[PDB]
Write a protein that binds this ligand. Structure first.
Ligand SMILES: CCCCCCCCOCCOCCOCCOCCO
Ligand SMILES: CCCCCCCCOCCOCCOCCOCCO
Ligand SMILES: CCCCCCCCO[C@@H]1O[C@H](CO)[C@@H](O)[C@H](O)[C@H]1O
Lengths: 329, 329, 329
């Protein structure tokens, strides 16, 4: 919500309260999953060719006790400041989205699941700390519909090596016309010494790229995505040496509020030390959201797992149904 | 404070800053006790028979250092979303108040102490996670003043068994007219396997109920409460097998802002393994609040303990004086 | 930002997002330093002689992962409530600034570094919990420009002895006239039982004082500060028995937004068990801020260390450069 708008500064205070329950035979995917979000987004007119901005956003879990587990799963998601230069681009620095998510985002539209290859603290695939990002939308006022980005990532040496990284760079590009769109992105970075002493994954470089296509118009959404990761997909005991990742989704928006969705996700891991080849994501998803208005909604999401019992990286293979009730402002 | 109200959505951002000091021999009840609260509460008109809503609230302690103890005592208190269907009731889901607090609340009006049998993560007696709640005010438009609710609780398997529960149900009912009110509530739920392995308390089911009466008019507040808990009152080393719980309060509001208060609290535990019967709450309370206006107040509260020296359940038995200065919005 | 102003109550919601990066050969001062701040400050008119107020403020680090280190370095900075009595002063209680920071603050104007002797949970040099503070500005309306304060500090017995204190008191005084100002302040406190068993610093009593003056007008800022601490300057392994502390700074504000700065800081610790005398702070600082307007700015700060590589307290001696981009509201 815009709660301040005066003398060239605007300030949005936004958030949501999400009542949420999972039903599944798995232990870790069953029970209460309620949570809340809070953030600000501000914008200030400096002159005719320059505008400054900033944003912060946090996750408050609603399924902890008020005792020793109170802080579990709570965290800042975004935190950055930047400058917008008229037609000539934007630059911002802080905790933000990696450029490979410009591609991975196109199938990340399910009511509760989806988006499985874009994760936090994972080089360029999701939200990461220490990113410097330049974007130019509409290509300096001449080739509109054509968007481009370039990004630098500074080293983060963390106690948890699966959430660490060394220096890297990324780039992305997308074009839209008449409801059709296409996008691609590539990034690469150094791995840290601690990442190279883990049980899975060998190599000096982490690389991620993905590419995709969509039609998004006339109440219709379709998109398909393919990509690959080297020494970069995060697994339970380290990183996969290489992966092949694919997803696809189809949705329609009825005028009276309902929006059904069907999707399929499959990813295969390759040359895991002592294990070989094996699927690490594989499921069909069917669900729907009902929008009462722009502030209230409800949903059901049904994840139909198609991994098997002899899964050889030990990944769980049960189903889940999710039921959600959302108030947002 | 209402900070936004536009096109059918309203958003109240509320909170307070409480400067607070305890005087006592206890040690765990003697230093600085300063804290702050922040929350939002929102409401959106969907159509003439349907409003959506959501609420979140958090506690930030003000008596920690900025070092390693910085997070001690910090937590989410409330987090839920719901739908109100005109006269046919309301439904919300998340972290909210258990229905037995509909009765326990009537003597929870002291300046600093009081409310001792209604606590967090304690089945239905206070704030608990995973509550699905139905309420109906005014009985479908037919009986003005008459309220009831029905509530389901999903199990919470936590590392701390004293803050856990299994599945359960609860219900409540109250009537008000001409300044008088009356209320009762009952709930029951399964206990977890770990709750059945603690040194105090044995049994498969936990039960809580309480009932009360009040007069609230002409600057006068009086109320009395009686109830009992089975395998559900939390003690130092587990749960009491049975309890008998009683409290009573009397207050008067002078026109120039001062509001004195006196109360008495007595609770008895029965058949504790290796101990037998013994009081676990027993005290007299004297205090006063002075309201400067609806945003500012100050108070003193004097708790006069009557538990016995070196008692057999190990409960501390000292007095405490509390002094507070409160800014709220 | 002022977001509510109605019937005598107003509420300011304020904060900032700071993208910040450090460059240095010291590994503990290198990489991402992004963070964000959020707070409220409210005020309520009671009558012609009486205003209530309250404030809370929090620090959210932006350079943690979303995993197990998420809460690292996050904390409440301020939390207090108070009363303003027209001309005859103010009183507040909670977590606030100690009165010796009335003096130390005059050189705490660098873009990033500086302010080294005023720190959190350090008796009266910075922000501390449990402070009762009385101030009188303008000396009852009689002696204009002349400010006075007196303060009581309650005991904080914490697990970390380096962030503890016993009971104490402080006082300060300042005068301004014609762009010139002068200030001095003194406080003294008991030390806790555990503080007296550390490797460095002995005595059952702590003391702090500082004094300084400034010229602040016609786009010029100049100021110098000197003070001393007994059993109160916090070092790595306890407290220095005595210190001599000095700082000085000079700044000019150009009309088009630029503000360069130079400063020099030197503090010497004296009579350290097994060490004798040794410097614990020593550097030259050059930097500048560019203000785009009152909501957006950018800065570079260059810390030129002049401690020696064989320092007897083992304090690191490399240089650091900080670059920052700041949005605030
Ligand atoms: C046995 C000691 C009980 C604790 C009471 C201490 C009295 C000090 O409080 C006085 C402050 O209250 C202001 C009225
Ligand atoms: C449980 C006692 C019910 C109290 C009913 C009082 C009704 C008063 O009359 C309403 C006219
Ligand atoms: C609005 C409340 C302001 C209270 C001012 C603090 C009163 C100082 O109180 C002191 O602090 C210590 C802890 O209880 C004790 O050891 C002292 O006996 C007590 O006098």
């Amino acid at each position: 919500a815009e709660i301040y708008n005066k003398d060239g500064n605007k300030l949005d205070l936004y958030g949501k309260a999400v009542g949420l329950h999972y039903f599944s035979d798995n232990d870790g995917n069953d029970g209460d999953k309620t949570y809340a979000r809070l953030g600000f987004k501000g914008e200030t007119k400096i002159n005719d060719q320059l505008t400054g901005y900033g944003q912060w956003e946090y996750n408050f879990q609603g399924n902890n006790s008020e005792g020793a587990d109170a802080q579990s799963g709570n965290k800042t998601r975004l935190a950055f400041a930047g400058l917008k230069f008229g037609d000539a681009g934007s630059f911002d620095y802080g905790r933000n989205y990696g450029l490979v998510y410009d591609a991975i985002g196109i199938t990340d539209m399910l009511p509760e699941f989806g988006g499985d290859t874009g994760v936090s603290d994972n080089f360029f695939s999701g939200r990461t700390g220490g990113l410097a990002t330049y974007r130019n939308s509409g290509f300096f006022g001449l080739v509109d519909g054509l968007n481009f980005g370039v990004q630098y990532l500074g080293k983060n040496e963390r106690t948890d090596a699966l959430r660490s990284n060394g220096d890297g760079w990324a780039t992305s590009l997308s074009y839209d016309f008449d409801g059709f769109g296409i996008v691609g992105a590539y990034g690469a970075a150094d791995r840290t010494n601690a990442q190279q002493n883990l049980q899975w994954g060998k190599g000096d470089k982490a690389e991620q790229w993905a590419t995709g296509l969509k039609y998004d118009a006339n109440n219709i959404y379709l998109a398909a995505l393919y990509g690959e990761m080297r020494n970069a997909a995060r697994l339970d005991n380290g990183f996969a040496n290489k992966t092949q990742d694919f997803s696809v989704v189809a949705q329609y928006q009825f005028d009276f509020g309902l929006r059904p969705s069907i999707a399929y996700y499959k990813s295969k891991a390759k040359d895991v030390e002592g294990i070989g080849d094996e699927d690490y994501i594989n499921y069909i998803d069917i669900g729907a959201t009902y929008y009462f208005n722009k502030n209230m909604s409800t949903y059901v999401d049904y994840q139909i797992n198609q991994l098997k019992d002899d899964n050889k990286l030990g990944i769980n293979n049960d189903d889940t149904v999710a039921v959600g009730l959302v108030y947002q402002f």
